[PDB]
Symmetry: C6
Subunit: 264 residues, 6 copies
């Protein structure tokens, strides 16, 4: 149960968790700044969901029957002082002890693996080669894939992150198709490539909460850059995340992966 | 000749929104922040609309039973404004960050129009040719044309039309028509193009088309919509490709004739 | 029966009342007019009463000076602040009354706005003088000789400009508004701010609902390069439009009936 | 006495005058829109001041000893609904019956006469030839003129307009040096010349309240335009006011005056 | 080594502003909207500061009587914050539209520095040469330099300086010094240039200089101020001419030497 | 003695209290830090207590993980909303403590920031590895191998980044912040947004007041055309600055004492 309208008005209420409308994250709450929004992941509800999901016979049914638990895993706190109290919020870069990974590449750092390219680049054909559990579908027009494929459709960024976090923590392999609504949604002062700089900070923040969760989430991003600034934009995105695969006319045109070894 | 609004029987909260957690748990109709199972939110720019699928369904069966689609819509403004409305609770933007509409196709969905096996959603008719686009709409055997945001002309007096004033009733009338088995077209989304403010066109126009497209897909309908994106001739092919990537289908019109047509299909 | 100026609905009961009363639901005789990020309303019942009284006067200009309060009751800005949310991307619906007819500005001219664009001072004066207007509603322009000697009524804001023009036209008179200079300057959006076009379509479509034509002088002040495209966008927004160059009519486009 | 903090909260208070914090101008109140500000002139206090000023032996002492009356002549109402109630407010173009004028030119329409040019154009040398009662000094750095000259120094736009209105109504000849703070202060979408379009509407509004008052006020304006857009800017300003004299390197480079006859 | 703030004896209203007409008639110090005869408002960008000439005068006589100007300013933060403050009442922008500061010169005013018969006001020292501008300030026999908005350097430890943190105390210390007969300079207005946001430079920088210039003229003082407008080399002569047109005087510095000097004078 | 988070002064009495308590007047041990349109505060008394405790630990990195709450009490964002008005165009005053000395990053280096700008990933790593740092405070960068294996402490926001660096430096350790990437992205104003420069001057001058040097990695992301002017503006804002090109030092400017 998450507080939706009533927020802390006294110091005593202010010290409560973000779930309860306070301004101080609980021991199991991690704040996720996205543009000028501030989300929160509850790692105990995430643990509960992962344990339960790993016990179920259908990742499909499970998520459809537990949007209550999903909406409790990642939510947007109601207290409005969060931006002031946590100036220029990011997510701290830390990796769990004993973290290992063989996917999407050997020793892939925990974080996001962006699958990047323009429309028609080959992105929804590359995902099929990554041998995923399912594709989390968000912010994209309904396709034949959403009937015949292995999908879970979601509506906002909370559900997208929540289902991805739960799946990965359960030992499953998630992709989000796509972060279109961050690209369109995060308005900010532009850079040399034309993209809002807050889109880059947003990806680092989301990347580093996957880092803290010791997981990798593969995410489709079409940054809508012109031919000229594309290489500058892809370099700023690679500088923001663990891994990035660039697709161009049906073939991989660049791959950058941060690894536990420092080597490819 | 007038339209009956029966404001007595209207239950959408217009000014009182939830102030407690208990109230916040109510439906968007009631001023809460959590949609009931029959409410789907529709984000468009910085606005959040909502469709009531229960009210939508009963409206469609009534419209189908009526003698005259046009007269029914004229007599039932109240039911139209109860089908698609803008909820009053202000926290919806925060609670549902970067909201879209989830891609879905109801079971057993079939469609032969505008093309065989047309995915549910929007079918944009883009271009800039008043003669061409009307002439194209006249060929699709539309039950009527929902007129919105365009200057009055001969057709509004002459043809099978139903004029509306805002995005709520444009979508409501389209939904009620398609659900009832009729063929709606919206002429036009001119006011989304002008009103949604964010190469050449506000990026938020694209997500608003995806959101509205995906509502139609959840409802298992196709709504044909006229859209003139006002692009420079140079950047027009880019904009048309961005728009095709946001929706189920799109027909392009050039100098009075259909030049291009892209359609996502099933099976 | 006065327009609510500060007190707006705070309960669901008050929200159901009319815009005049501070509610959020128009009465059957109220038509909302969205202009930029303002929302005005015309009261067709007050409009019809004013048109009846004006017809009994021997001088339309004097009648409006004698009836300022009735004008502010014909078109007003409702007080309820949730109207933007409740009516998203509001326009005015394109409708023509039963058995409408017209012969001015042209035969079978659709009801709506007729824009008179471009020209020049002495060339705008001439084209307006050639239209046999009952009077020119003067708005947002510096006082010149015409405001002393001519057949005019000076107004101060867009409510009065629209009100006076609506009342004259429903009375059977021919009004022209000189000019929409404060729409052009006042309405800013994403080389013309795009909300000028929908504003004129909205004002155009209330005229069509009222079954009238209102002539309006409007200079978009576009660069001469973008001018031809600018004027195209304007014509696509209204019933009719005349372009003036060097005193003569260079283009006239009119939507008509049969 | 003008209401400064307490504004109408009921319909009954709303119908009171703008001086009393209502939303409806009294019969003697004229609203003056300037950018996104809305001023008000009280013509009865203006009449009282003009009558009293015409009776005094020193326009100088009079204004210095009566800032109370000055601040009651032009003021900024406190009610905030004014922008909504009066959409796209201007001042209506009307001339008093029997209006005559021989200054600054024969049959000069009532309004503003702008004295326009860049810094060093000759503006404070042209004013000395116009044989003025005094120069109202506003928004300009203190000079030797402010000690040795015939001046009244003011601080805001209310005092500038109020002293000008009172002087002219009293049969005296005022100039305002200068409208610098409108040029700098009125921010708005720019035009083809680079100047905010709200500066033009502001000058028409102020022009037409001089029109209603049957007076001419001469006003120094440096619009800060570049050489290219200068001629386009001066034409938009001339299109906004009764009269305009352009100064360029110490000589008049254009004069446009709207007259009662339509002839020069 | 520290600065004594005595917050007990401080009467500037910081959070309670007038809510009634009677309260609105009080001084700006008291949270009202009408300045007392000894308060002059100072508009700077979208902020409105105020100078208390009574407090200013007593401060100047005390500083003149003290043994050490620097120590006094260090011990009297409270009196400094009582000399120049930002009033709390929010309606000041509306009540005083497009506020400036009226041009005035008190009777009998005389001045020999920076030049003979220098009009009271600001004297800007413009340029971009750290070595040049310090070297120029070192030549004017300044009593000390008010350091504000600049990175700490050797001079702050070495020279006759007094560091401050905000525009209020920068102006207050300058006013109290000049009124007492000492020679202040402010190094620098870097934060007005950066903070005032409206060919190349925010136009509001020019009016803020005129407003501050005209306060100094009403006080019968000259305050020398370092100002780097950050202009492109192309548009630098235009910006320097706009700045000279806003103030009593201005010295231009090029590659380590005074190149130009414009000064409005009296008699 | 906790930082007030929601309750700010509403009376003149409460306004006189400290920033920690929700007042509007800093105590003698509070220094305000304006950054863009945020205002933070450092508590030098909590800072000194933290520096004492940290010195008694055998591992600075572990000490900070053990003392998160003390960090948020060293640097915080005060709750009172009138601070912007009360302290116009706020900076931090340039002052150095009595008998300050320094030999790192260079001899007699002024207290303040030392910027390390440009370079590249492997070239930024090398220059930092060559500075003999106690640890690198990692902020706003994606997790890489260095955050697992290196001498680091990861933080989440600018309060923690500044707090950790202040505490280390007052303890006698050498901190470097990698990086100010969220200042560059987060601070927008009128090709660099101008408020980045005053922000660094403000952060620079609190370091000078504290009598410390803090090394900070910052990539302004300027075009290569404007890069040389950009770096000039940055150097004019801080105590010292190193420019890296292709692994080597291409420029180093430092303000010094004697």
């Amino acid at each position: 149960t998450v507080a939706l309208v009533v927020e802390a008005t006294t110091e005593a209420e202010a010290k409560k968790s973000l779930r309860e409308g306070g301004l101080v994250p609980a021991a199991h709450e991690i704040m996720i700044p996205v543009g000028n929004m501030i989300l929160a992941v509850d790692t105990q509800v995430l643990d509960k969901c992962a344990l339960a999901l790993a016990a179920s016979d259908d990742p499909g049914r499970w998520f459809a029957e537990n949007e209550s638990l999903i909406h409790s895993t990642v939510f947007a706190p109601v207290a409005k002082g969060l931006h002031r109290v946590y100036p220029l919020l990011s997510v701290r870069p830390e990796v769990p002890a004993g973290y290992e990974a063989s996917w999407p590449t050997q020793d892939h750092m925990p974080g996001l693996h962006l699958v990047v390219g323009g429309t028609g680049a080959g992105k929804s054909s590359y995902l099929a080669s990554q041998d995923l559990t399912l594709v989390i579908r968000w912010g994209e027009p309904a396709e034949r894939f959403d009937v015949e494929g292995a999908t879970h459709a979601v509506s906002d960024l909370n559900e997208a992150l929540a289902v991805a976090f739960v799946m990965a923590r359960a030992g499953y392999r998630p992709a989000i198709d796509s972060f279109r609504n961050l690209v369109f949604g995060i308005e900010s002062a532009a850079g040399e490539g034309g993209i809002s700089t807050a889109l880059y900070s947003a990806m680092t923040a989301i990347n580093n909460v996957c880092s803290r969760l010791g997981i990798v989430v593969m995410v489709v991003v079409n940054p809508m850059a012109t031919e000229a600034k594309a290489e500058l934009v892809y370099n700023n995105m690679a500088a923001s995340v663990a891994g990035m695969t660039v697709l161009m006319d049906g073939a991989v045109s660049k791959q950058t992966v941060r690894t536990l070894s420092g080597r490819t």
